[PDB]
Amino acid sequence: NMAIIKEFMRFKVHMEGSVNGHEFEIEGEGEGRPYEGTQTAKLKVTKGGPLPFAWDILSPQFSKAYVKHPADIPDYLKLSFPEGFKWERVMNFEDGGVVTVTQDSSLQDGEFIYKVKLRGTNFPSDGPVMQKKTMGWEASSERMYPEDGALKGEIKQRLKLKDGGHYDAEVKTTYKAKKPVQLPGAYNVNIKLDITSHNEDYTIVEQYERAEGRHST
């Protein structure tokens, strides 16, 4: 696996989504250092732009092959290649907005290929998502554990608000390799996702993420 998941790897991503019925597509490319836990992505809205909602609800959906893992925590999602893995996520926001996501991760011609499908619903029309009142995510801790033959992660994620405070989301994700490979025990992942640039209407956006697994015991 270290022979095919190289220390520098690129990816391509496609998202098809809808948020409160507003349909869109995004395409992007990324690159990073999977064993160092760092990566960047450049995203472009290719249909449905400009988006009438906060970019921040989409940013966490654009790459868990790039988490730095201590040697004694099995790196299940790297080990899943070349076949790769899928993930499925639920985000429940504190005002009743919901985002569900499914994703396929594969490796083709040397690059990761990500296909994301996203559905956001029931965001209040005057809430911070539809009104674009958010200012990026706080650093997160994803609590990971094996269950039913897959890897699960849970987050209490917090979006900064322009007028102060936070807009919170409870997130739960299942990550499942396409072939059985070794699952880890319980551990945590420290994640910090930054928007490093964007144009005025968020149709062109660059992101940076650092993700590092840490022991829980």
Q: Which residue has the tokens 């559905």?
A: 119
Q: Which residue has the tokens 């790196």?
A: 75
Phi first, then psi: what are they for 200, rounded to 5°?
-60, -35
CA 122 – CA 182 distance, rounded (Å): 38
CA 144 – CA 53 distance, rounded (Å): 30
CATH (domain of 49)? 2.40.155.10
Record the resolution, in angstroms: 1.4
- Distance between alpha carbon 163 and the CA centroid of its chain, in Å? 25
The answer to whether the CB of 186 falls within 8 A of the CB of 145 is yes
User: What 8-state DSSP symbol labels residue 128?
Assistant: T
The answer to whether the CB of 81 falls within 8 A of the CB of 4 is yes
The answer to whether the CB of 191 falls within 8 A of the CB of 62 is no
> Which run of H or E residues covers position 79?
helix 76-79
User: b vs e for 94-126, b when ≥16 Cβ sit within 10 Å of the residue's Cβ?
Assistant: eeebebebebebbbeeeebebebbbebeebeee
Number of H helices, E strands in the chain: 1, 12
Domain span including residue 153: 1-217
Experimental method, per PDB record: X-ray
CA 197 – CA 189 distance, rounded (Å): 25
The answer to whether the CB of 67 falls within 8 A of the CB of 145 is no
Of 113, 96, 112, 111, the residue nearest 167 (C-alpha)? 96
Q: What is the DSSP string of 27-76?
A: EEEEEEETTTTEEEEEEEEEESPSPSS-GGGTGGG--GGG-B--TTS--H
For 56, the token pair is: 């921040």
For 55, the token pair is: 């970019």
- Distance between alpha carbon 206 and the CA centroid of its chain, in Å? 14
The answer to whether the CB of 158 falls within 8 A of the CB of 184 is no
- Cα angle 47, 157, 16 (rounded to 5 degrees) comes to 15
CA 115 – CA 88 distance, rounded (Å): 12
> How many domains does the chain contain in total?
1
CA 213 – CA 129 distance, rounded (Å): 30
CA 203 – CA 68 distance, rounded (Å): 30
CA 110 – CA 12 distance, rounded (Å): 11
- Cα angle 25, 27, 29 (rounded to 5 degrees) comes to 160
DSSP bridge partners of 47: 25
Which residues does 181 contact at the CB level (< 8 Å), separation at least 6? 74, 76, 79, 80
Calculated CA dihedral for residues 211, 163, 45, 103, nearest 10 degrees: 40
